[PDB]
């Protein structure tokens, strides 16, 4: 029969699941990073191919993939030519797109992915739209990185005696294992361009906030609202009244509270969703070749 | 006689000027970066020694130096022991301190230096104090870097259609030579951690603001007030109602205005830099060895 594979090619690993056109599970596979910025073009393609081959237990007829790192036309031009060789029919979209389809089942909608970085992805039935998601320096409002940076800067001002030291102070220092300004500065010398390290601090902000720290609550509230404003914008342009929320930042009770409060004041319904990105990739493929999504889901 | 040399050991170059103890100019000299984070410890020391030797036309008796890069006790422990070999008597301070002494002549005071980075340096007659100045990620409010980053982020939102494009849009793109979102993202792949490059965008914000772009004006306002608040804090802490302003950001008319309007509301008067940091280093030395600053300035 026809072998359809859905792939979620991320920055850390690549996951693939295979199904026929009648909704029957065939298999699953995994490989290294699918983000070519992390392992290079050839290796990324190689990992995606491996994952696909393992899940399909051989060659695949159709492959739908959600890829991380295609944030500029130049990226697509570099990636598409090779990725298209993986199977006779290949549908390629942003990793955020398959996360959306996993919930909308291929229908119009908007999804917010707030983790280390942040982005708002949408589909209007004709094309895919995006706001944000262009990196830590230029964008990523309300992401773990954004929150971590805000915390670091507040901590510095506390050390300078410009603001009172709150619970956040100790939480941040413990998180990166530094005991004072001298060590914080030393830390900046080798950690300033390390995205993951800065983002790891969002965890300390969440803890401080749960313990009642006004400074930490403010960072979460402000970050959530900055990104939520962008989610409302895309929902309005797409013409939808609901948005899906995904990513580690939503695991923060306070961040989720303020994010949803902003959406509700605008009359927007939110939903954490309930499916995996790879399944969204299978749905992406189903829509392309015409297989019945109802046989796949429920 | 006694040959006293003042040194400004910076991130791009080291400048030195030599004088005797009677205020008489002897000579000047320059060399590579004095910031060891940029060229390594040994090369930094050699460059400082080279500038000193050229300026002094040989060995110097006393050397006062303002060094960039000593932003943690760890930096001082690494630098001090070697810099002390440059001359029989060596006085070492932050690059910001000699910039301060160049204006206060060794007396108490506060100076704001807003260039690629930002910092507020102070002296109360005994201790040297500082707020900010700890790097682009952790601090440097209202610096050219800080301003450039805000500009970049505003431009991205304009490209996303979240807000209308203003004069700032084209100004920023022209500065970093990008024509659209696709090229801006590609630019970020290799330039996100190039501090000087991001800082160069501050000029675009200044031009946009002068041309009536209120989005650009607001960026300058926010940056200037964030740093001005720190200047007020240190001035109040030290006990002075006057602050000196130095650095490229003050070349921006609107940034300077928001800055001074803020200081004025807080009862603080300000003066733009008047002397070079190297002369401030000579002053630092003079204070140490007892040479009359009156004969120098």
TrEMBL record, chain A:
Its EC number is 2.7.1.1. Disulfide bonds join 21-291. InterPro entries: ATPase_BadF, ATPase_NBD, Euk-type_GlcNAc_Kinase. ADP 1 binds at residues 11-13, 15, 116, 199, 206, 248, 251. Pfam families: BcrAD_BadFG. SUPFAM superfamilies: Actin-like ATPase domain. ADP 2 binds at residues 116, 199, 203, 206, 248, 251. Residues 5-285 form the ATPase BadF/BadG/BcrA/BcrD type domain. It comes from the Archaea. Keywords: Nucleotide-binding, Transferase. It is an enzyme of class 2 (transferase). This is ATP-dependent hexokinase. It comes from Sulfurisphaera tokodaii (strain DSM 16993 / JCM 10545 / NBRC 100140 / 7). The lineage of its organism: Archaea, Thermoproteota, Thermoprotei, Sulfolobales, Sulfolobaceae. The gene is ST2354.
TrEMBL record, chain B:
ADP 1 binds at residues 11-13, 15, 116, 199, 206, 248, 251. Keywords: Nucleotide-binding, Transferase. Transmembrane segments: none annotated. The lineage of its organism: Archaea, Thermoproteota, Thermoprotei, Sulfolobales, Sulfolobaceae. This is ATP-dependent hexokinase. InterPro entries: ATPase_BadF, ATPase_NBD, Euk-type_GlcNAc_Kinase. Disulfide bonds join 21-291. Residues 5-285 form the ATPase BadF/BadG/BcrA/BcrD type domain. GO terms for molecular function: hexokinase activity; nucleotide binding. ADP 2 binds at residues 116, 199, 203, 206, 248, 251. Its EC number is 2.7.1.1. The keyword Transferase applies. The keyword Transferase applies. It holds the Pfam family BcrAD_BadFG.
């Amino acid at each position: 029969m026809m072998i359809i594979v859905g792939v979620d090619a991320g920055g850390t690993k690549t996951k693939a699941v295979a199904y026929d056109c009648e909704g029957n599970f065939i298999g699953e596979g995994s490989s290294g990073p699918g983000n070519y910025h992390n392992v290079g073009l050839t290796r990324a393609i190689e990992n995606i191919k491996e994952a696909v081959k393992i899940a399909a237990k051989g060659e695949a007829d159709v492959v739908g993939m959600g890829v991380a790192g295609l944030d500029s036309k130049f990226d697509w031009e570099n990636f598409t030519p090779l990725a298209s060789l993986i199977a006779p029919k290949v549908i390629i979209q942003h990793d955020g797109v398959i996360a959306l389809f996993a919930e909308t089942l291929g229908e119009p909608g908007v999804v917010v992915i707030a983790g280390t970085g942040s982005v708002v992805e949408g589909y209007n039935g004709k094309e895919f739209l995006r706001v944000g998601g262009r990196g830590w320096l230029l964008s990523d409002d309300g992401s773990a990185y954004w929150v971590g940076r805000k915390a670091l800067r507040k901590v510095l001002k506390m050390m300078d005696g410009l603001e009172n030291k709150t619970i956040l102070y100790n939480k941040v220092l413990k998180t990166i294992n530094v005991k004072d300004l001298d060590e914080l500065v030393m830390w900046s010398y080798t950690s300033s361009c390390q995205i993951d390290l800065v983002a790891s601090i969002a965890k300390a902000v969440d803890e401080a906030a749960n313990e009642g720290d006004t400074v930490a609550m403010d960072i979460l509230k402000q970050g959530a609202e900055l990104l939520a404003s962008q989610a409302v914008y895309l929902a309005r342009k797409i013409g939808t009244n609901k948005v899906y929320l995904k990513g580690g930042m939503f695991r923060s009770n306070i961040y989720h509270k303020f994010f949803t409060l902003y959406l509700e004041k605008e009359g927007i319904i939110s939903d954490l969703g309930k499916r995996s990105p790879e399944i969204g990739a299978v749905i992406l493929a189903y829509k392309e070749v015409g297989c019945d999504i109802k046989k796949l889901i429920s």
